[PDB]
Each structure stands twice: as structure tokens, then as C-alpha cells.
Ligand binder design. Structure first.
Ligand SMILES: *[C@@H]1O[C@H](CO)[C@@H](O[C@@H]2O[C@H](CO)[C@@H](O)[C@H](O)[C@H]2NC(C)=O)[C@H](O)[C@H]1NC(C)=O
Ligand SMILES: *[C@@H]1O[C@H](CO)[C@@H](O[C@@H]2O[C@H](CO)[C@@H](O)[C@H](O)[C@H]2NC(C)=O)[C@H](O)[C@H]1NC(C)=O
Ligand SMILES: *[C@@H]1O[C@H](CO)[C@@H](O)[C@H](O)[C@H]1NC(C)=O
Lengths: 395, 395, 395, 395, 395
């Protein structure tokens, strides 16, 4: 238009994009800083970074960009590109990013009274400590620290406005609890002037449904399947063939486990100690099976039974469980009869060893059942906010 | 040429690339916005982003770029680079991209009557919720929201033209249903002026052929192979050796399953519950086998059979299935005869236990056959648009 | 030098880098477009893109860059950077690239008669459909479509020169057949003027040596190893232990298979149906083995043999294969004799079941040998250009 | 403000951003260089690079940027963007980075007395040798070498200030020992002038908790589980079925091992030789088992025992371990009696072979127990700073 | 300073950064090109690219940048940024890079006599053929071809200086042999003028320690472990259970093999044929075992032995190996005696089949031992420079 052309030619005249737009040079320039969270992209435990989609919001008052609407009855707002008017240098302090800015400077909207508004959208990568001790029942607290790079409290004093979470697009894997802000002042031993900053703490909770369905169920099933070894009869030559195949399947399942579990060495994740306890239980099952088989295959050369060994496994442990011419012909045939009698005596004395082995199997079944139930329940129950996690996620 | 040189020297004189090219400053500038879809690149369920190849199309009318063709009888169109003439700032609102623009500003074609045309090609990355509850029989609805960044409805009012799908280059994995557009207006509690926008909804359907050939076939084959355990005779010492090897193969197959299934914790995908049901069936087969083997290896010390146990497995379940001097010589030889008689009696009483075990095996075969058929059919049939998916993809 | 300084100061005077360098403004500017292929980088079936190393070649005639050599007896050529002289905007239409250009604008060489030459080197990413139906015996046809972005046929008319393949640096995985070009004209219903373009079709053939050595050999070996089950004698309790271990090895081999086979759902690759047929054969071997073992372990309670079952497996199938006081003493000893006689009769009647099982094993060996030979030969032979692929690659 | 506008218009007048800001041109310009470490991102053994988050700090004195505060009673500091005032070109010499700079030039703060301050934040990628001989008990020494690119010691002489480690955000995987600095001078055979530089040596120690819990525990468990083979009785046909299944599980565990262990060929990592020793032990267990089984299944055709073989395994090795009409009737019945007697003699002579096999099993159990204990303890104990690593990490 | 300010204001006056800085325009400008190698980053066999860290070195003589030191007694060198003085356009011809330059133009140092020096550091990505026929005992020859983009031999003639390898930071995986240079001239059929270039050939040798410890050792161990099958006695039902478990472990080991071996189809790598020979040997072991077991389980219905079969396996092959009233009572008891006699005859005739099976096992052990020794030694020894590789790497 004919009016906004002369207004644009008038505004930029004798204008310097390096001076702070104030009227006295001794008064602070009030900048209202806010934030708008759009979504959470990824949370990396390897490099300890947090990727979010955030729209910043800045608003200050300029003094050299004021005009009377009466002389320009068709113009109410003007827009300037990046590098033609003064802009505050507020940027993320953490900013664990390659280019460190990730801001995409857009145009700057200015009203007719000098009130300037500016909101650059970008994807930020902050650096926060991730505590993985109670994985996967953990809760994180990551900080976003904004502030001016080279302006003090007497030149550009930051103010804070509540963050906006409208249009959050829930992540699905992480659940957002809230995002409060806080303004602080840092003093140096130079000048006795404040250095204000605005920090937003993003509090988020991990969802434990995918892990509880894809890691807990197969581990519990394999651990309970490993206990069937004691139920098998020793006559079938398939006891070790099951006891070691379960362990092989656990080893191949740890391959799927590995790609998920974090590799931090600061502490021991709860899922790691749970899987290690399960693995130790399955490992000791084979040793118990080996001892039971060493007791079942009793060669007929080691007596009947030691008194100390018998008096326990057949009287006390079995009580707790409630198991419960013609002369040559005569000499030729009585030898066969006595041979059969002696073989029957040998098999009768060797049957009790098999019965003791069955008793030992039942004892080990009870002991390992209570071991695995107690370990599996206790390890998961010991974690904090477990009841809150199951109540929110599962139910 | 001698004429277009002076025309170029004439057009840019007293021209400002920051003013909106209108003649009254109070009338809106009509901008016709369209879209051209070229292909769909990827659909990421991890970060919930959509990558597409899109050619935008913009068209407005300028006022300071008009010239009479008679004075320039060799020039009909002129082209200006980026940053020399006014261009609308229409850009994607979602734009889950690193640089947020991905536009590649090209030249701007202008006719001799001021009609300007401009179409920048680029690859866009929108952010949409992906609902994976019915994976792999799901249908998605992703939105592309375009609009002016800093112009109101009284300055730059958007119009919509139907999107073009000519030259679509079908993806192969995702099937496009359509892409309709809609223009909406958003009001603020400041000014009572519209803020128009143009949004395009991309509706696409997943193709279920690769999954139905590479995941369903091996799982069905393994599940049906696990049922052969009951058909085996108990004499061969190879029953557990098959029952647990099938489970080991299922565990190693879950490794291939894992890289495909999504990791979202918002809901349970249908393929996950189908594979979990198959795994539970294969797991319980081993427990049934253990009980059957515990019944086959009956030691000759526990009586013939309890009446309650016998009267079922041999009379009712077997009816439903329709299974159906010389004194010393005499004393020495009659002992052998009676020993043989007693051993034959013992083996005769122990044969019925094996027959009961065979009956139990047949019952478990029937029960597990109907269990696996019902589960496999029901889980897949319960999903919506399943008949549409199979009719379009397979047939 | 003293002369080229004044020549450079003379050429750029009153020069506009936006005007088309012609002398009448109504005559087309002839631009000769060529191409030089250096190597093929990658062919992606996931996103359907093609990455190549290409050196474009452009050549046109300028009019404002002419000088007489006599007045400058030391200067014959001059070079201008990007953005100081007019350059055609020829660029790839497909260009499935992030920045869409990938050109690296170099200097522009100009002769003393105005003949300008310019060749920018870059790495291009085109988008072409990849048909994977006959994988790995497939042949592709990918297109590279070049043309002016905003110039018509009456302003900038493209000409085509044959592509150069000198210095091709063969890929090793893909074999190049050729690269012919073609110039076409597209008409619009506006102006009745041509819109010329130049397109190059890159025809390439996949090399089938790595696949034929790393996928076909192990699959054939495993499939032929699975047939040894029928050769084993039934006395050894190791028949299922081999039949199911072969299947477990096939399942773990499919993990290596998975990372190679494409994931397109448009059609069924030939390697997928070949591996599926092999897997189905190995699966049915176990069912046949289960039936054979169910026939070998015949309990002595089911008669001798049904007439219909016997008359086939022992007369017809066996013919086709060409298998082929003292009273008490007497009562006490004749009982033992008759017991031995009856046990011998029972074992004699039970031997024929084992012989029938051996006959069934031989029949199944022949049937499965011909099944696997026919399937393996037919699936590979059915593909087109198979004889050409083996003749070129292997021999 | 009205004063800082004229101050900005005054400072840049007759100013050249290419001249070194001194007053005599023969005196060096003192530049104080420091460093601030924020975190360690990654340590790559593949390409031998180190990624860190570092905030440089530079401080020099300018001469043309001095003004009197009395004439500008509202201005105390001024800020200039990149490219408007002279800045030193100090940059990382190693800088194994794509763009080689990674600096993100910010504004430059200047006091009223000419004292200029400038601190650019960025992510650096240095190149250092990583010695992996004692993995995972290794300690590294990576260098960061800073210095001027094109200024000598008589123009820009570097000074060093102690690095700051406040706000270190511990990595979790690598433990920082310290970061001392040093200033050195390099002389050339041209000019006899120093070329100063500032180098910082980052000393870090690897944390051995994740490896000690996820690699040592399963390997020790599998190695000790492989020793149960000797404890098994030979009657059960399951000895090889365990001895080879343990080896199969070790082979599948090496897959998880592979993704962690480095691929450098300069030396042999300690974890590689430990896992190789474990694998060799498990391999030789099967050969010992094969020999034991070849001794257990003694066919009754090879005599009783060779004297040299017997006199050891039953007298010395067993002492060290402390194992410890009527004529036809008579001819018909005495033959049966003698046949039974001869069969009993044969089984009695064949029992001693089984006893010798048990003795051999016990000897091999003791020998392999001491072998595996000595190897496992010695390999880990031989590494340096092992006691320091366990004392700091575990306890 | 006061002098260098006027010197900088004097040098750039009437200066053009596009003219070649000579004094006659007909004389070539001598440019001395060198190179400095810092390290080798990666060698990719997939795309056939080579990534190196290289510092170029250029040096020419300018004519318009000369000043007398007496008039400027404080200035000896001046520095100009990129784009203010003329620089040669020497760049890598291969340059298989995205941006094709990767140079990071730094400042240009100039002496007081016009001697200009310039060395830009960068990371280059060349494209060279990698011959992988003798993997992992291969030696490569990759070329780096530098030259002027648009200057002939009569304008800018290149000279070559020997490359510098001081500070090489050895890679660890690749061993550098040397890097010689060569200057060549290319003539066109236009002008009869040279087009000089400078090319450096990087010769490097692969280190075979990691492969020789992580691939050769497990393959040899598994191959030698597979031979124990023949040593086992046939009485134990565990022969196939070992023969097929070894093959399963080999199949799972090929998964680790796959990620390392290249995927080029140009030729067959030596490691591929070695692993294939090992796999074929292990495969044929199972077939031999099946035949041996088919000979061990001889049913008592097929005669004693065919003469041709016996006369070899028991006379020749066993010689080469040096294996070596009362009437009813009488009728009732003589039947039992004759039954025992006939059963003893049957077992005596069936023992020789087992002995022949043992002889066959020993023959197959010898044959397969020599097969595997010859194959394993020959395949590795056939490669060139094998003795050099082992002498340098291992010893
Ligand atoms: C301008 O700022 C600089 C910042 O370093 C001041 O330099 C320091 O000033 C303090 C205050 O007296 C001294 O104690 C230090 O010794 C100074 N540092 C050095 C390296 O000399 C400088 O004094 C300030 N100038 C004015 C006029 O305020
Ligand atoms: C300016 O610097 C250049 C740097 O190369 C000097 O060139 C070398 O100077 C040494 C010193 O006499 C000679 O030995 C070499 O032969 C020169 N190199 C060449 C290629 O000629 C140059 O002399 C310096 N000029 C002045 C005036 O100091
Ligand atoms: C510069 O320094 C030198 C000695 O360092 C001195 O002789 C000379 O006078 C100084 N310059 C001025 C202008 O004082």
C-alpha cells in the first residue's frame, strides 16, 4: 500500500539492530518469557539427553517502533525478519545439541504502540541425569534452564509466565506429571547485581505395560517351567534333557533382554537383579537334579544305606510330607533257584535308593517353589510407587 | 535482451520486500493454497512422525509487478529469487522437523498482469498419533495443518484447492485411501477476527501380506507341531525332547518377532496377544506331558488303582472316545514257577496304568486341538475391517 | 594482470544476473544438457530411492560476455562464481532428497566468444519403483528426469547429448546394462507451447552370486539333511531328536534370512516362497516320523494286523520296492515251558509291525526325495532370465 | 537510548575487523585461554574419537574500543556480533570433526576500558589413541590441543588458566580422574620465535560394574555348570546331552559378548582371553567325557584289563582319592546252569571297567576344578589397578 | 596499530578476488601442492569409500600483495579471510562426499614479499575399488586425485611435494605401508595444452589378529569337536545327539560370522569358502553316522553277512588298521535248553555286525581327520602374503 511503504521507509531510518531499545539506558528492559510444550520425542539413557518439541514465547516493549495510527489508517502491525531489529539472546543453557541453538528464528510481530512479540519454534536437546535404579518403575526430573547469555539484571530482567500444555500429544511410553517453572537470581562477587534465569522442571513417569507384558510374562513362565523337573519320574531318561534345555532357552531370552536394559554402571537396575535371581534359580536346579540322579543310579555294591542318611530321608522327611543220579540234578537246579533268590534280594535292597531319591525330589520341589515365589514377589514389591504404577497403568 | 534489462531495472525500483503487496492496506490479500502429494516415505511409531514428499502450491496477486506488454513486446513472464519480492509465510504447524521448514525456496514466477505463482518442493515431517491397538489390521489418520504464521484473516485470508494425487508412486507397505482438505477459522478473545488455516487429513491403510506370510505361517506351524506330543507313544523316550524343543524354537522365533512389533505402552497390539496365547498353549503342553509321564512310569508299589481315578478314565472317558529225594527238587522248581507267576501278575497289574496314560493323552489331544483352533481363529477374527483387509490384500 | 583486471571491471558493468542472456527476447536459448555417471552408491527397497554419483554437464551461449582477443592478448577464458552470471535452473524432478538440490554450484567457464560451460558435480537421490517379485533374479528400471523449473519451450529449449559411462567403477553388487536418454515435450491446456525435458533410464541387473553362495547352499544342505530321518533305524531312540533339531536349526537360520529379504508387501519374493516350501517340507517330516513311531511301538494288545492295513503295506508296497510225586514236577516245569512259548509267539506277532514301519519309512523317503527335488528345481527355474543370470554370474 | 546509539555509531567508525588490536604492532597481544568441562558424551574405540561438551573461555584487551563513562553515563558494556570486531582464531588442533570448528560463535562482551571477553560453547570431537589391552580395567589419557592457527609468539602469546570442573554431570560409565593443563612452545627452523599452545589432558577411568554383573556372572555360572558332567552317573544316557548343551549355550552367549567387545587388532583384550580360556575348558570337557564313555561301554571281548592300565587306575589313583532216562535230563539242566554261571562271570569281569570309569571321572573332576579356578582367578588378578577398580566400584 | 590499519586499507584498494594474480597474463602461476595425512577413519566395503583425516598444503606467489617493510616497521605478515583474495580451486576429483568439498576454508597467510601460504584442514571421502578376494589377508590401493577444476597448464601448473606422515596415529585395524605421489598430464584433442594433476596412492594392509582370534579359533574347535562322534561307542544312545548339536552350534556361529563378512558379489572371499568347507564336513559327518547306526542295529532276519561286504570290512580294512512219566519232563526241559541255545546263536551271529560297525567308525575317523587337516591348512596357506601377515601380526 501507499501508506505502509512510507511507514516501512520511516521506521528503519536511523535504526541500529545492536542497541538495547530503551529510553534511559539505566532502566531494565522487562522481557516476559514463557514456554509451550508440544511433545516429548525421546529420552536417551546412553548420552543422558532429552529431546522435546517446544515453542518458546518472548514479549518485550520497544521504543523506536511506535507510530500514530491516525497518520497510517490502514496499518496496525508490522513484521521484521531476523537481523533487522533488536532481539533478546535468551537461549537454553544446557542445550546438549550440535549447533546449540535449534531455534529457527522467525519474523517478529510488532504492534503500533511498540509492543513486540516473538515466538520461535524448535526442537531442543537438554542434558539431564537419568536415575535408572528402579527401572522400569522409575520417575525422572529433567531441567530446562533458560536465561540471557550476556545481559545482567539491570539491563534485561526476565519474568516468568506459566507454561502451556494444551495440545500435548501424549508420548505413549512416558507419562507427563507436570511442568512447573521457577525464577532464580545468581550473584557474582564482582558487581552485586542479579543475573536472573527461568528454569522449567519436566517431571515424567515411565509406563510399565510393555515391559510387564513382554519381559515379566516369559521370565515367569520359564522360571515356573523349570520347576517341572522334580515332578518327572526318574525312570524316563529325560530329566537333564529338560533341566538344561530350559536354561538354554533362558540364555537365548537374555538376548532379547539385552537390547532393552540400560548399560549404565552407576547402579544396579531392578530388572537386572530380578533376571539374575531367576537365572541363578534355574542354574541351581540342574545341580540338584544331578545329585538326585547320582542317588537314583545306585550300583549294587555300596551296602543298603548309611544310618544317618536313612534315618532322615525315610523317617523324618518322609513323615513331614506323608509320602509313605538225582544228587547232581538237585545241585544243578537249586543253584538256579538260589541265583534267582539272590538277584531278587539285590533288587529289593536297591529299590529303597530310588524311593529316597523320590523323597529328595519332593523336598526340593517344595523348597524351590517357595524360593521362586518369595524372590519374584519381593524384588518387584520392594520398588517404590509400584502400587501407583500398577494402579494407573494396568487397571 | 535490450527490453527485459530495462524492465528488470524498472520493476525493482522503489520496491520493499517487507510490505504486503496490496493497494488499500485494509483489504485482505487472497492467497490460494493447494497441495500435491508425491509419495509416503516412512511412518514411525517410535517418535510418532510421518515423512512425506509434498509439493506445495501458492498463488496470489501482486500490485507493484504489473507492466504493459506493448512496451515490452518480448517479455511475458519474469522470475525473482528468494528474498527480493514479498512471499507469504505459510508453513506447516506440526512440522516435527529439525529445521522446521524443509521447503527449499525456489524462484517465483510472475505474469505480466501481476499474477504471481510459487510452488516450493520439500520433504515434510508431521507429528500425528498412531493408534496401534489393531496391529497389523490398523488404519491411521494423520493431519497436515498449514497456515500463516503472523497474518490475520483481514490481511491474508487462505483459500483451499483440492489436493492432487496424480503421480503417487504407491508405497507398497501402506495403502492410501484418500486425502481430503478442510478450511477452518480460529477466533481469539482479543480482536474478533478470523485466523484461517488449511488442513489435509491423510488416510492410509496398512497392508497385511508380509506379516501374514512371515509371522502367521511359522507361528501356526509351530503351534500345530507342538500338538504332536500327545500322538507319540510313551515307550519311546523322546516325548519331552520334542515338547521342550518346540518351546525353544518358539523362544528363538520371538527374537524375529521382537524387531517388528511396536514398543508403545498405550495399548496391547493384537499380534502380541496372539503370540502370547500361542506361547501359553505351548507352555501348558509340557505340564500336561509331565503329568502323563508321571502316570506312565508307575512303580509296582502303589496298588492297582484308586476307585475314583479308575472309574472315570477307564469307564466314562474311555466310553466317550470309544478307545476300548524228590521233595527238595519239587520245592526248588515250584519256587521258580511261582516267582514267574508273581512277576507276570505284577506286569499285568502295571499295564493298566499305561493304558490310562494313553487315554489321558487322547483326551488332552482333543482338548488342546479345540483350544488352539478357537484361540487362533477368534483373536484374528475379532479385529475390525479384517474381512476388508483379507479381501483387498490376499484375494 | 593489467589487462584482465580491466576486462573483469568491464564485463560486469551494467550486468544483471536475473535476465536471460539473449539478443531478441523472442528467440529460445539453446541449452545442451548431458550427463556423466560415476558410480551407483545404494539401491534402497525400503524407501524406494536410488543414490548415484553423477556429474551434470550444461552448455549455452551468452551474449553480454563477448570480448575481442586482440585488445586483451593475454586473456582467453574467464570464470565467474555462483550468483554473478545467469545460469539455467535445470534440476532433477524426482530428487527424493532432503535439500532437493545436492549440486554444489562451482565456477562457470566462459570463452572469449561468449560460449559458456558449466558442470556441477553432486550426489543425487532419485525415487523409482523397485519391483522385487523375482528377487534375487530381478532387473530394475530407474528414471532420472531433468528439466527446467520455470522456463518454457520458447525461452529455454533443452537438447540432449549421449550420456558418458567412462570411469564407471563397477559397483560389485549391481551390474549396469546401459543408460539411454530421451527428450520429450509436455503440453498444457493454456498456451500451446512445449515444455521440454530430458530423462535418462538407468537399467541395472542384480548379481546373484553372494545370495547363491550364502543362502541357497545352507538351505539345500539343511533340507537334504532333514531326509536322513527315514534312513535311521527305529531301534535307536534318536529319530525325533534329529527331526526336530533340524527344524530348530532352520528356525535359527531364518534369523540370518530375515535381515536380507525385503519387507515389501506388494508381492511375494521368490526367495520367500522357496524358503517357505523348504520349511513346510521339514515340518511335515516330523509328522510322518510321529506316525512311523506310533506304528513301531505296537503294544501286544491290538491283534496281529487289520487285513486292509496288512494287504497293502506287506504285499503291494513291499512288492513295488522289493523290500522282502512227579506229577507236580511235570505241572511245574511245563508251565514254564508254555510261558516261554507264549512269550515267543507274542514277540513273533509283534515283529511284523516293526517291519511294516520300515516299509513305511522307505516309502516316505522316496516320496519326500521327489517332493524336495521337484520343489527346489521348479521354484528357481520358474524365474525369468535365470539361465542368463547363472551364465553371466557363475560361469 | 540516546547515548548508546551515538556510542555505537562512534565505536565502529574507521574500524577494521582484520587488524590485530594493538598500539605498537611490535608487542604481543596477551590472550588468556581457559576451559570449562560440562560432560563427556561418548568414547568411540572404533574410530578413536572422544566427544565432550566444553565451554571455551577467551579474554584479551582491545585498544580501539575504549570510551569514557562520564560522557555516556548510562552505558558500561557493549556487545558485538560475529564478524564485526577482531577475534582470536584459537581452535582445536585435533578436531576430528566433519566441520572442524563446532564452536557456535556468540556475541562478544566488551567493558568500558577495552577489556573484551568471549566464551563460545560447543561440542568437540578430539582424536586420541585408546589402549584397550586391559579391557575392562583400562585407564585412558586423551589430549585436547588448542592454539592459534596463524599467529606467532610475538603477535598472540597464549596464557593458561586452570580448567573448571564445576557442574560436571557424571557420565555414569566413565569416571573422571582429573584434567590438568600445560603450555608448551614449538620452535621452527625459520625464525627463532615461539609458537605457544595450550593442551589439556583428560584422564578418565572405566567403571567395571555393568561388565562385572552382565558378563562375568553368566560366564562363571556356565563354566561351573559344565563341571557337573563328571558328577553324573554313567548309567543315565544323558552325559553328552549335558556336555554339548552347555557348549551350545556358551556359543549363543558369545553373541551377546560380541556386540560389547572392541574390534581393535592392536592387542588382545583381557576379556577376550578370559572367555577363550573358558571356551577351551568347556571344549575339552567333552573330549574327556567321550573317553570316559568309551571306557564305560566295554564289550565282553577285550579281556579283563591290561596290567599297566589296571595297576594305576585301581591301585594308585584309587588310593590317592580313597575311592575303594535221567542222563539226558541231567545233560539238559546242567547246560542251563553252566550258561547262567558263565553269564554271571562275564558280567562280573565287565563291572570293573565301569568302576575304573568312575575313578577316571573323579580324577577329571578334581583336575578340571583346579584348572578352572586357577585360570579364572589368575586372568582377572593379573590386570593392573584391579584392586583399585573393585575397591572403588563394587565396595 | 596505526601502521597496519593503513596497510590493510592500502592492500585491498582496487583489488579483485576473481583475477589470477600474475604480472603478464601469459605466464603460468606456479602452485606447490602437498599433503599431510593425520589418520585413517574408516574403510567401507559396502559403498566402496575411504574416509581419511588430511591437511592439504598450498603455496603460491601473489603480485598485488607486496609492500616494503621499511614503511611498515611493525608488520611482517597479513591474513585475509575466505572470499577476499584469489585462491586456487584445487579439490579432490573422486570426493564421494555429500557436499563434495569438506575443506573448511581458513585464513590465508601472506608474507611481505607476496609469498602466500594456505592450508585447509578437512575430512575427505574418496571412492576406490576394494578387492576382497583374499579377505582377511588382503592389501588395498586407494587413490586420492587432486587437481584444478577450471585452470589449464598454461595458467595454473601444479607441482608436487612429498607427503608428510609425521603424527600418523596408527589406526589399529589397518596398517599403512606408504603413500607415494605422482604428477601426470592429461591432453585433450582441443588445444594441445597439458592439464596437470597430483595423485597420491594410499597403500594399506589389513591386520589379521582379531579375525585369527575370534573366527578361526572357534571354527577349528567346532570342526575338531565334530570328529569325536566316531570315537563314541554305539551302545550309548547319544551319537546323533552330538552330531547334530555340533551342527546347530555351527549354524548359530554363522550368525556372528555374517555381520563381519563382506556382502560383495564380485568374488568369493577366502573366509567364506573356508567356513563353507567346514560346514560341508560337519554336514557329511551326520550322514556317515546315520549309515554306521543303520549297520549297528541289525535285526536278526538278514542272514549273517554278504560275502563281498564281509571280506572287505573284516579281512582287509581290519588288517590295515590292525583292529582284530519222565518222557514229558524230558521234552519240557530240552525245549527250554534248545531255546536258550538258539538265542545264544542269534546273539553270536548279530555281534559281528556291531564289530563291523566299529571298524567302519575307525575308517571314517581316519578319513575325516585327514580331510579336515588338509582343507584347513590348504585354504589358509593358498592366500598370498600369508607368511608375511603372520610374521608381522602374530610374531
Ligand atoms: C572492565 O572489565 C574488566 C573485566 O576483567 C576489568 O578487569 C578486572 O577488573 C578488576 C576490578 O578492579 C580487577 O581487580 C582485575 O585485576 C581486572 N582484570 C585484569 C585482567 O586486569 C576492568 O577493570 C574493567 N574496567 C573498568 C574501567 O571498569
Ligand atoms: C616471505 O616468506 C616466504 C615463505 O616461503 C619466503 O620464501 C622462502 O624464504 C626463504 C628465506 O630466504 C628461502 O630460503 C626460500 O627459498 C623461500 N622460498 C621460496 C619458494 O622461494 C620469502 O623469502 C619471504 N620473503 C621475505 C622478504 O621475507
Ligand atoms: C614499539 O616497541 C619498540 C620496542 O619494543 C619501541 O622501540 C618503539 O618505540 C615502540 N613504538 C612506539 C611508537 O613507541
Amino acid at each position: 500500500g501507499e501508506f505502509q511503504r512510507k511507514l516501512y521507509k520511516e521506521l528503519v531510518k536511523n535504526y541500529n539492530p545492536l542497541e538495547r531499545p530503551v529510553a534511559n539506558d539505566s532502566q531494565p528492559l522487562t522481557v516476559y518469557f514463557s514456554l509451550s510444550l508440544l511433545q516429548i520425542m525421546d529420552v536417551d539413557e546412553k548420552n543422558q539427553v532429552l529431546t522435546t518439541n517446544i515453542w518458546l514465547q518472548m514479549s518485550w516493549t520497544d521504543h523506536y517502533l511506535q507510530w500514530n495510527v491516525s497518520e497510517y489508517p490502514g496499518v496496525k502491525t508490522v513484521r521484521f525478519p531476523d537481523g533487522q531489529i533488536w532481539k533478546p539472546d535468551i537461549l537454553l543453557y544446557n542445550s546438549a545439541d550440535e549447533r546449540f541453538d535449534a531455534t529457527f528464528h522467525t519474523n517478529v510481530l510488532v504492534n503500533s504502540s511498540g509492543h513486540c512479540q516473538y515466538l520461535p519454534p524448535g526442537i531442543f536437546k537438554s542434558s539431564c541425569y537419568i536415575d535408572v535404579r528402579w527401572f522400569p518403575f522409575d520417575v525422572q526430573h529433567c531441567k530446562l534452564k533458560f536465561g540471557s547469555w550476556s545481559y545482567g539484571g539491570w539491563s534485561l530482567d526476565l519474568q516468568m509466565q506459566e507454561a502451556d500444555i494444551s495440545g500435548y500429544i501424549p508420548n505413549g511410553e512416558w507419562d507427563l506429571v507436570g511442568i512447573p517453572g521457577k525464577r532464580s537470581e545468581r550473584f557474582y562477587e564482582c558487581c552485586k547485581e542479579p543475573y536472573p534465569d527461568v528454569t522449567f522442571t519436566v517431571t515424567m513417569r515411565r509406563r510399565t505395560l510393555y515391559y510387564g507384558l513382554n519381559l515379566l510374562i516369559p521370565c515367569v513362565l520359564i522360571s515356573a517351567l523349570a520347576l517341572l523337573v522334580f515332578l518327572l519320574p526318574a525312570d524316563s531318561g529325560e530329566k537333564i534333557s529338560l533341566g538344561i534345555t530350559v536354561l538354554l532357552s533362558l540364555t537365548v531370552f537374555m538376548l532379547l533382554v539385552a537390547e532393552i536394559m540400560p548399560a549404565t554402571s552407576d547402579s544396579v537396575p531392578l530388572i537386572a537383579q530380578y533376571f539374575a535371581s531367576t537365572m541363578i534359580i534355574v542354574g541351581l536346579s540342574v545341580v540338584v537334579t544331578v545329585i538326585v540322579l547320582q542317588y537314583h543310579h545306585h550300583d549294587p555294591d555300596g551296602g543298603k544305606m548309611p544310618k544317618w542318611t536313612r534315618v532322615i530321608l525315610l523317617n523324618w522327611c518322609a513323615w513331614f510330607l506323608r509320602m509313605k543220579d538225582l544228587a547232581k540234578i538237585l545241585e544243578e537246579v537249586r543253584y538256579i533257584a538260589n541265583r534267582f533268590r539272590c538277584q531278587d534280594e539285590s533288587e529289593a535292597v536297591c529299590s529303597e535308593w530310588k524311593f529316597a531319591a523320590c523323597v529328595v525330589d519332593r523336598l526340593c520341589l517344595m523348597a524351590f517353589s517357595v524360593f521362586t515365589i518369595i524372590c519374584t514377589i519381593g524384588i518387584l514389591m520392594s520398588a517404590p510407587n509400584f502400587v501407583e504404577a500398577v494402579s494407573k497403568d494396568f487397571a
